[PDB]
Structure 1
Amino acid sequence: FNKITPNLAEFAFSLYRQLAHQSNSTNIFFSPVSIATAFAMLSLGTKADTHDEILEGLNFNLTEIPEAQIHEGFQELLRTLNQPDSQLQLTTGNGLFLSEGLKLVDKFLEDVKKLYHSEAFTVNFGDTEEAKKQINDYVEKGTQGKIVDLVKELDRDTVFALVNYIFFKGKWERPFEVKDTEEEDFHVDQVTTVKVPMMKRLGMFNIQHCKKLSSWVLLMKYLGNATAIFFLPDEGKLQHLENELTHDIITKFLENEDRRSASLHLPKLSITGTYDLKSVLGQLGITKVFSNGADLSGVTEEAPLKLSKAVHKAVLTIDEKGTEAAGAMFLEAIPMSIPPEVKFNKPFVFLMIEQNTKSPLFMGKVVNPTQK
């Protein structure tokens, strides 16, 4: 793992826990890497308390880790993510939208693009309709039509908007068969069910029951170099599971590549998290950059500037296999013994971890696959 990976994992937990505290009856899905990288990039146009709040709010202890190490960490992570031959189906973008008429520092726009692969734009925020359409149409192009009408309301006074999007439709190394998917109960609570398409495969899985977490733990690899890890808590143990997750625990799971016989039920779902990062990151202690006090002098030298709007949109599809064009053919040997049936048919927590850095690309919880 990279040197900033542990801070990223702690950030993931802090933001997840915040979101879990905010509601227990909604699906959660967000990108820790995506949000952190966007605010690491923003921090380059900041100074002092404004700057320090962002990095401390991303779980860096600035009396401990040098700022340069933080940035080459995000850099290195943005290098493995943006491989030419990635194979990982990961569309991600950062849109900086600043009012026209501000004289922008060249080096900030130079740092943004040719270090953090973000996009900077000068727009007339005088007309909300033009500015909103400019913002949504950029996200439309960037996701290739997968995210539309993202921004619902822009303020009249908005001078600076950050939009952060991510769509992920993964291809399983060891995929499910479409023919075996059938509609089944998902237990949204102890007495209520909902119908979901349930994917099913008898095979050899990295799957075990962890008594410490009171959870079943499933790891499945994606094409590209990322791993989905699913935690299915015993009854009454969801909150325990949320409380007890650590990065060292996830690391231990990824280090074991043992497989056992199992009949797995995993729902086919599409989930999205839409987050107001001003609200949400404000709760983690990032307030100055969003206020009149903000020192954004690395973005514009003479004029007062604050971050008016910051939005995260995360979209995920889980299916049998996110592409219908193959080549790699294999054979798992199932022993004669009767396999456990393990069904992810009630609320569960997940992470997608990029393999080279051990970064948490995504974290989420499914409470109701039909909750949209």
Structure 2
Amino acid sequence: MEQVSASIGNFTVDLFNKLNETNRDKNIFFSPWSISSALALTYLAAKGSTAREMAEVLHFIHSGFKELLTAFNKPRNNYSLRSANRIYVEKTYALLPTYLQLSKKYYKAEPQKVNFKTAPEQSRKEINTWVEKQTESKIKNLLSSDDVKATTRLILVNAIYFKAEWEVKFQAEKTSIQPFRLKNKSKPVKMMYMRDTFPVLIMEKMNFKMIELPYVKRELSMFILLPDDTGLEQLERELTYERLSEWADSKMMTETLVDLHLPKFSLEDRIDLRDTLRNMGMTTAFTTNADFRGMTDLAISKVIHQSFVAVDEKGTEAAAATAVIISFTTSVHVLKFKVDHPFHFFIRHNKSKTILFFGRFCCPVE
């Protein structure tokens, strides 16, 4: 379990940087966990050189997913981590059982053979529906008429739902419309607020403070690396999975009374990873000369991923009802932790340190 989590950990920072390079000016967001996991599948069918490269990319033993997969989906109640990763091939291609035995074994998921050959526009609907069913109906039409063709061969789709009430919800009566500073730009945002205790990590060394806003029973938590004063460029350079792990896990990050200002925000992203992965070192799995002989005797033609998040006075897409609210403002110093400028933020399964979501917020720009 502690070997895979590092893999993701790295794959994450990398995937991030890449995505960044293109959009040095966008809000980056994705589920590193929902991608390695989904890419693991094909991988568990990628032999020879197609693998040697995939391994390099995802940073690669195999039970690390079964072990984490249940951990999360099994109960680890108090947060819902519904995900949908599958492999759709044409009715024509041939599946070599061992693969089925294994996918079913670790990934409680079976590759579905579909008819792309003469029911492209239909197969699609079928897919976009499975997604819809597996995500609690929050992810609509994942694939577009342009994403499914008769030329299509292997489509790996990977989405993921996610609900979690914060541990200690904010009071809406306190959310005021403040300005999210971007020295020349600035726009407004419903800025949540509360005074409480959170593990914080300060350090003038790299000029940035870190806070851990824990979800229920602190199973999963959100971490916000906020640069003392996009202003993020320097902090993202120093960014490593090493430094992140030494930090969040650091015995130097401790509970502190804090006046918290957290922009009630929201991000959703869809990513056609083909170009991205090709560029990161995964190339051969897309040529017709793919060594996917692990499952058949064909190449990935697409990979559509799609995650989202919506921080609010409850955490994320939460079924709420905070019936009884009874705060006791009582009396008498504070670490003002105002999150009113570009920041980094990720969500983790603290137990296992697996980063599930990761992102950068810096643009309310509509």
| Fold equivalence (TM over 0.5) | yes
Matched, 1:318 2:311: yes
| Deviation digits for residues 51-106 of structure 1 (CA, Å, limit 9, x no counterpart) | 1111111122xxxxxxxx2x122222112112235221222110211111222122
Question: What does residue 195 of structure 1 align with?
Answer: 188
Question: What does residue 139 of structure 1 align with?
Answer: 131
3-state secondary structure, aligned to 1:200 = strand
3-state secondary structure, aligned to 1:151 = coil
- Structure 2 segments unaligned to the other structure (5+ residues): none
2:160, 2:307 within 8 Å by CA — same for their partners in 1? Answer: yes
Matched, 1:219 2:212: yes
3-state secondary structure, aligned to 2:63 = helix
Superposed counterparts of 1:90-101, under 5 Å: 90-101=81-92
Opposite residue 184 of structure 1, the aligned amino acid is Q
Matched, 1:129 2:121: yes
Matched, 1:230 2:224: yes
Compared CA separation, residues 261 and 333, structure 1 to 2 (3 A) = farther
C-alpha separation between the residues in 2 aligned to 1:105 and 1:334?
67
TM-score, scaled to structure 2: 0.90
Deviation of 1:334 after TM superposition, in Å, equals 7.1
Superposed counterparts of 1:1-150, under 5 Å: 2-60=2-60, 69=61, 71-125=62-116, 126-150=118-142
Matched, 1:258 2:254: yes
C-alpha separation between the residues in 1 aligned to 2:328 and 2:48?
56
Of 145, 152, 171, 1:158 maps to 152
Question: What does residue 361 of structure 2 align with?
Answer: 366
Q: How many residues align?
A: 357
| Deviation digits for residues 178-203 of structure 1 (CA, Å, limit 9, x no counterpart) | 2211222112x332222222111122
3-state secondary structure, aligned to 2:121 = helix
Deviation of 1:212 after TM superposition, in Å, equals 2.7
Question: What does residue 63 of structure 1 align with?
Answer: none
Deviates more, 1:216-225 or 1:356-365: 216-225
1:53, 1:285 within 8 Å by CA — same for their partners in 2? Answer: yes
2:63, 2:106 within 8 Å by CA — same for their partners in 1? Answer: no
Opposite residue 238 of structure 1, the aligned amino acid is L
C-alpha separation between the residues in 2 aligned to 1:85 and 1:211?
36
Deviation of 1:331 after TM superposition, in Å, equals 8.3
RMSD between aligned residues: 2.3
1:183, 1:198 within 8 Å by CA — same for their partners in 2? Answer: yes
C-alpha separation between the residues in 2 aligned to 1:17 and 1:332?
44
TM-score, scaled to structure 1: 0.89
C-alpha separation between the residues in 1 aligned to 2:325 and 2:64?
36
1:261, 1:335 within 8 Å by CA — same for their partners in 2? Answer: no
C-alpha separation between the residues in 1 aligned to 2:324 and 2:93?
53
Deviation of 1:176 after TM superposition, in Å, equals 1.0
1:8, 1:360 within 8 Å by CA — same for their partners in 2? Answer: yes
Opposite residue 113 of structure 2, the aligned amino acid is T
2:9, 2:241 within 8 Å by CA — same for their partners in 1? Answer: yes
Opposite residue 349 of structure 1, the aligned amino acid is H
C-alpha separation between the residues in 2 aligned to 1:198 and 1:56?
41
Opposite residue 194 of structure 1, the aligned amino acid is K
Identity of aligned residues (%): 31
Question: What does residue 280 of structure 1 align with?
Answer: 276
- Structure 1 segments unaligned to the other structure (5+ residues): 61-68
C-alpha separation between the residues in 1 aligned to 2:204 and 2:231?
11
| Deviation digits for residues 198-222 of structure 1 (CA, Å, limit 9, x no counterpart) | 1111222222432233212111111
Question: What does residue 299 of structure 2 align with?
Answer: 306
3-state secondary structure, aligned to 2:332 = coil
C-alpha separation between the residues in 2 aligned to 1:332 and 1:258?
23
C-alpha separation between the residues in 2 aligned to 1:333 and 1:73?
46
C-alpha separation between the residues in 2 aligned to 1:76 and 1:330?
40
C-alpha separation between the residues in 1 aligned to 2:95 and 2:324?
50
| Deviation digits for residues 98-122 of structure 1 (CA, Å, limit 9, x no counterpart) | 1112221222123222311234222
Question: What does residue 265 of structure 2 align with?
Answer: 269
1:206, 1:260 within 8 Å by CA — same for their partners in 2? Answer: yes
C-alpha separation between the residues in 1 aligned to 2:41 and 2:72?
16
C-alpha separation between the residues in 1 aligned to 2:176 and 2:17?
33
Question: What does residue 352 of structure 2 align with?
Answer: 357
Deviation of 1:236 after TM superposition, in Å, equals 6.0
